[PDB]
Ligand binder design. Structure first.
Ligand SMILES: Nc1nc2c(ncn2[C@@H]2O[C@H](COP(=O)(O)OP(=O)(O)O)[C@@H](O)[C@H]2O)c(=O)[nH]1
Ligand SMILES: [Mg+2]
Length: 172
């Protein structure tokens, strides 16, 4: 059982590692093989926060951003949305603004937001500096972390940070 159930969604440009982030967190696996669908709509991981048991239900886009678009209902039912970009791809960071506008168009009014810059292991290809993305996130009052699904860097922390934000909003 659990004290709380939080529904999370990862959004962002195709191929930034959203599915790899989910699979690393929920299953502790990583592959470079191409992923269209993960065989389920969501994965589950149960965490502990402040002595409370929190079931996290984390939904995958099923690659719908590859050739079409994310449906509005996927936005509306989330308690928190993680916007992911690829630190080696300037365009994916530029498009974070558009993903935030989609959240404003379709998500719940009080949804929690978190910015993640993934593939932080690719040091020689990195083009979005930590300071650039942190300044942007700070300007919106949204938390920000850099992650590596491949090396597991900050992946658990990213989901724990989102859970902490949601719990704080729920208790207020
Ligand atoms: N180097 C590195 N590559 C990654 C990482 N996460 C994902 N990738 C690569 O990015 C590709 C696309 O990841 P995927 O999870 O399918 O992206 P999605 O379309 O956003 O769900 C993968 O096949 C990996 O090659 C990471 O943390 N580091
Ligand atoms: Mg995917």
């Amino acid at each position: 059982e659990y004290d709380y159930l939080f529904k999370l969604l990862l959004i962002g440009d195709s191929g930034v590692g959203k599915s790899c982030l989910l699979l690393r967190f929920a299953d502790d696996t990583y592959t470079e093989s191409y992923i269209s669908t993960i065989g389920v709509d969501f994965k589950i991981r149960t965490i502990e926060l402040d002595g409370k048991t929190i079931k996290l239900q984390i939904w995958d886009t099923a690659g719908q951003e590859r050739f079409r678009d994310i449906t509005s209902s996927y936005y509306r039912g989330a308690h928190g949305i993680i916007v992911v970009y690829d630190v080696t791809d300037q365009e994916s960071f530029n498009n974070v603004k558009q993903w935030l506008q989609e959240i404003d168009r379709y998500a719940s009014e009080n949804v929690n937001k978190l910015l993640v810059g993934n593939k932080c292991d690719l040091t020689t290809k990195k083009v979005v500096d930590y300071t650039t993305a942190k300044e942007f996130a700070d300007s919106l009052g949204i938390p920000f972390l850099e992650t590596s699904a491949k090396n597991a860097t900050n992946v658990e922390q990213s989901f724990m940070t989102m859970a902490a934000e949601i719990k704080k909003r729920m208790l207020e």
